[PDB]
């Protein structure tokens, strides 16, 4: 029989996802990191075991994506430092162990001022850490998931530079194919520009070339960003040359016909750019603020549309942003500690969306 799955397949395989937030992602200057722990707990998360990292499962999940960021773990020519290497590969094990996919990434690596965000001056570091993880989990099977990069911007003056992030998402395939073993074949995400639909979508993004074609691209679904993102007690601010302040209305609920339909409109763009040309789409988050004045009710309608559309659209899936708990996160739906969620209805839609009910 066959032993491979094409990329649309896969991600059709992968269900339903979750990802482990603000663990093994963690960064701040003021923590001095010193062991894998001090960024494993910095955010207020507490160190994960297996239970911790795959109970998920049973309510309908089958994909964790595992958010790590990598800087504090790199000497100064890249190298990363055993330990940190080895606690990474303990949780892909546990997932994989579980029989559920993991999407591995590098994370806040690329955030504004970290050095990632330079952009191509620094493709032969992004090339020296892709070969070492590349290198570690070459014999792994098609569970696992390598993912370029999580939310990078580059531009060029006011243009989006699409040359830049091709440049190193090219960089991250050809290191990674080059290592052979079953990386020659493994699916792999590409990050669309700062994972933005619109911008991913649009006429100037370059996908990177793979004769495997075994490629997904990554959008993350905060939209529209005044109900997901948009803190509602610290509104978003501008502020004129004359210094007057003006607020950015956060919105609290979602849902009306015209939401509805720009939803519908977000995921044919999605779909006839990508999926339709054989390269499935994996929203590696969606999430809305947990901790705010968003109505619950609304929370629960947005995630259960979206995932709904997702189970609807071939080579779709979603991937939850997930904190855990507030004193470590600002997007909390299941208790990983505890094996709570915090909505039982967030929970029984997802139980009744991955059985097909
Ligand atoms: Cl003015
Ligand atoms: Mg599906």
Redesign the pocket.
């Given at each position: 029989s066959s032993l491979q799955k094409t990329a649309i397949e896969t991600?059709?395989d992968?269900?339903l996802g979750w990802n482990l937030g603000n663990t093994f992602d963690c960064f701040g200057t003021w923590k001095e990191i010193k062991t894998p722990d001090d960024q494993i707990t910095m955010w207020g998360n507490v160190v994960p075991t297996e239970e911790m990292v795959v109970t998920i499962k049973k309510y309908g999940f089958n994909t964790v994506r595992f958010p790590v960021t990598w800087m504090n773990f790199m000497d100064d020519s890249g190298n990363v430092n055993a330990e940190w290497m080895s606690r990474v590969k303990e949780v892909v094990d546990w997932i994989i162990k579980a029989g559920m996919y993991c999407i591995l990434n590098v994370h806040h690596d690329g955030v504004s001022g970290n050095w990632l965000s330079q952009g191509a001056s620094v493709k032969t570091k992004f090339v020296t850490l892709w070969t070492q993880i590349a290198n570690e989990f070459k014999s792994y099977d098609d569970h696992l998931v390598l993912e370029s990069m999580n939310e990078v911007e580059y531009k060029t003056g006011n243009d989006f530079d699409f040359t830049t992030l091709h440049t190193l998402t090219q960089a991250f395939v050809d290191t990674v194919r080059g290592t052979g073993g079953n990386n020659a074949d493994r699916l792999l995400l590409i990050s669309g520009m700062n994972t933005n639909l619109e911008q991913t979508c649009s006429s100037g993004y370059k996908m990177p070339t793979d004769k495997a074609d075994k490629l997904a691209i990554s959008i993350h679904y905060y939209l529209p960003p005044q109900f997901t993102v948009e803190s509602d007690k610290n509104p978003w601010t501008w502020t004129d040359d004359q210094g007057v302040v003006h607020e950015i209305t956060p919105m609290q609920t979602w849902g009306t016909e015209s939401d509805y339909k720009e939803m519908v409109t977000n995921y044919e763009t999605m779909k006839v750019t990508f999926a339709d040309k054989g390269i499935p789409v994996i929203l590696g988050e969606v999430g809305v603020l947990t901790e705010e004045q968003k109505d619950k009710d609304s929370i629960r309608e947005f995630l259960y549309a979206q995932y709904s559309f997702?189970?609807?659209?071939?080579?779709?899936?979603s991937v939850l942003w997930d904190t855990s708990k507030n004193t470590a996160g600002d997007m909390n739906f299941y208790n990983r500690e505890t094996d709570k969620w915090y909505d039982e209805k967030i929970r029984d839609n997802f139980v009744n969306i991955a059985a097909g009910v």
């Open positions: 991600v059709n992968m269900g997702s189970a609807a659209y071939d080579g779709f899936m």
